[PDB]
Amino acid sequence: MGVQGLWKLLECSGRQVSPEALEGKILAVDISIWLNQALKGIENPHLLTLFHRLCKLLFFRIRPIFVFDGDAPLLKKVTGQMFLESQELLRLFGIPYIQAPMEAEAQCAILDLTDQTSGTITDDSAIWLFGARHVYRNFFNKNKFVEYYQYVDFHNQLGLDRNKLINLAYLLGSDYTEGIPTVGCVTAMEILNEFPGHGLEPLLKFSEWWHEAQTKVKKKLRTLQLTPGFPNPAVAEAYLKPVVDDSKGSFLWGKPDLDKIREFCQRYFGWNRTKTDESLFPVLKQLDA
Template structure:
């Protein structure tokens, strides 16, 4: 999924672009998530359970940590990606992939669940990953949480992996600006590198490993020049290679106006009706989880009251937990700059 062996290449050649984090480090942050990746994780891990259960539990965990999640849904996939999607569906014994972008019954259920949980949902025109990257570039969100490394060639400034509820899980953050600086290449050159490594939108040159691909891009700057400097016998170039189309998908992803993001209180009674009465999930699981959620939030409220009394209150108050987030000021830094330097919107 995403860019083949990119994570390995970053670890070996640009380790400074990686930070080890904890979920609590993202308290007060607005995080965009590719919903299909989250749902597919639960489908693969617990095929006997509805993915709605996992989505319900994980979303509450984010909210408990004062993380403001924004769930982005896939639209119509690029035609260049259909073959990859079909292979993935076949390998997982799932139904054929959605070629039209029309919301499936499962997608509609996820929409409804997230609405009842009070978190924003955005429909992407194409790949959700591309829109997530656009949102962080625009400053609408602080980071993208995804297991898919192609967030980076799409221009996602900050990518977070392994952001989940497991206490043993070590959250990993990637900085695109630090990555490009360390590798000494531009974003456009990085996109060509990712195509050479292997992406979802076209074939790759066989036999060309990550180290060799990076060296070639650093020396020759684009795929057109790389092709002129490789041994075509040992590294055959695919016939009718669609690398130009893939490059365009990464660099010219559809853009959409930054939406107004609104978080509200979860509707417990409506959640019970939807999840338990309509979808057959055990009511005691839902009720107990909502009770823990209320207790955790109350504990946070008490902690912040004590902090204010001690004169060291945090900038984000519990009263601001559910609020409207306006579009942030357009950042002046280049693509890949850290979200920590962006101006955050003022509370109403």
């Protein structure tokens, strides 16, 4: 997912934060990535993963907002029952959620930019291209820490802004475009620095020069194979003006309903009161405290 290689390029701006430091923070969560990750990793694994991660989030007293994907963009190349079961569990835990118009990541980004949230929990590097400022990656991985990324930090460290990120998506490949073969981070940044310009002008100049010929960086730059339509401006316009809902929300966090969560866990996982309570009671004692 995301832009090929972008996280490794942003490595220099990553921070190690511990979950306890996120107490009280309102954070958005893209649940579609969870539902796909747990789909391939047991009868209801998506719901089991969702339950354990909800317990982890509420244990650290985070106030999460789950964001579901809507209609996929045409440029972008799993069941509704899973959506419904997930929303049922979220209501049982008292977690607000929203249905994105289209891209969930773009909606998380707009919640960030409108200061309705303190950031987004996701592993999708494409959220930077939608304008995100604060991202929490690898929240549930094998490490004892979450990776934290601030836009301003890698903007200062690397000079990357939204337009340069979109051009990197053109060069490296993303959900919306295939990217140029063999081109990696070093080559793509060489291309973007060789042809300075605002907006998409770097890639327009690069395509113009590659169509023309067909300098010691141009040496290998004119060995790349470019599609006839490169670059497709629909990609940049989808990244720059994604369909989102930028209205101010009215987010409320209710209290978890212990008995209905017991019933849910019994029906979907086969758990009795005791096994469910083993997971719930630390969460509840952290909340009521």
